[model samples]
Target: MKKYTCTVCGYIYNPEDGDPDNGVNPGTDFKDIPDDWVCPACGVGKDQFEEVEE
Candidate 1:
């Protein structure tokens, strides 16, 4: 699965390890994240995140 990095705070969003703090379970794809889900560290929207090349 692809990973996404938050441009505002450098927070790495990995599908293998979803944002538990935001009620996102593991294996949840970045595309599946809710529209309202913001970065846990920076509180930025999904548009603020970029696809990580891993």
Candidate 2:
């Protein structure tokens, strides 16, 4: 599971720490996340997120 960063709000989505607020479980990859998932901070669509180079 890779980390994804929200381009609009700079919200970092760490796969190891899934978004509990959105009912996403830990270890869930960005691809496995629901397509409707939006940034918790900016409310941007998932399409606005890009994989972190790390």
Candidate 3:
């Protein structure tokens, strides 16, 4: 599972530390997350997220 950063607020969504409190499960891939899922920080849509450079 990879991590995605919200372009709007810099909120990083890491599958390793899933936000179970909001329905995201650990090990869940960014592709597996729902399209309607918004950023936990800035409330931006998933489309606004970008993969962090390795």
Candidate 4:
């Protein structure tokens, strides 16, 4: 899977190490994450995130 970044705060969301603090299990794809999931640091919704380039 690919990683994503929070546009609001530049927080990187790597699927390989999901945000367990937010209940996102490891290996969870960005698209599979719940829509209600927000940025752990910025508090922005998933829609506020963008795909990260390798």
lDDT of 4 by residue, 1-54 (tens): 889999999999999999999999999999998899999998989999999878
Backbone clashes in model 4, listed as residue pairs = none
Tens digit of lDDT per residue, candidate 2, span 1-54?
689999998999999999997988889999999999899899999999999986
Order of models, best TM-score first = 2, 4, 1, 3
Model 4: which ten-residue window has the lowest total lDDT? 45-54
Quote the positional error of residue 35 for candidate 2 in Å: 0.5
- Candidate 3 — which pairs collide? none
State the C-alpha lDDT per candidate: 0.92, 0.93, 0.85, 0.92
Model 2, TM vs. native: 0.94
Between candidates 2 and 4, name the one with more favorable TM-score: 2
TM-score of each: 0.91, 0.94, 0.89, 0.93
The candidate maximizing TM-score is 2
Candidate 1 residue-wise lDDT, 1-54, digit = tens: 899999999999989989987889999999889999999998889999999986
In the order shown, the candidates' Cα RMSDs to the true structure are 0.8, 0.7, 0.9, 0.7
The lDDT of model 1 is: 0.92
Question: What's the candidate order when arranged by decreasing lDDT?
Answer: 2, 4, 1, 3
> How many Å off is the CA of 28 in candidate 1?
0.4
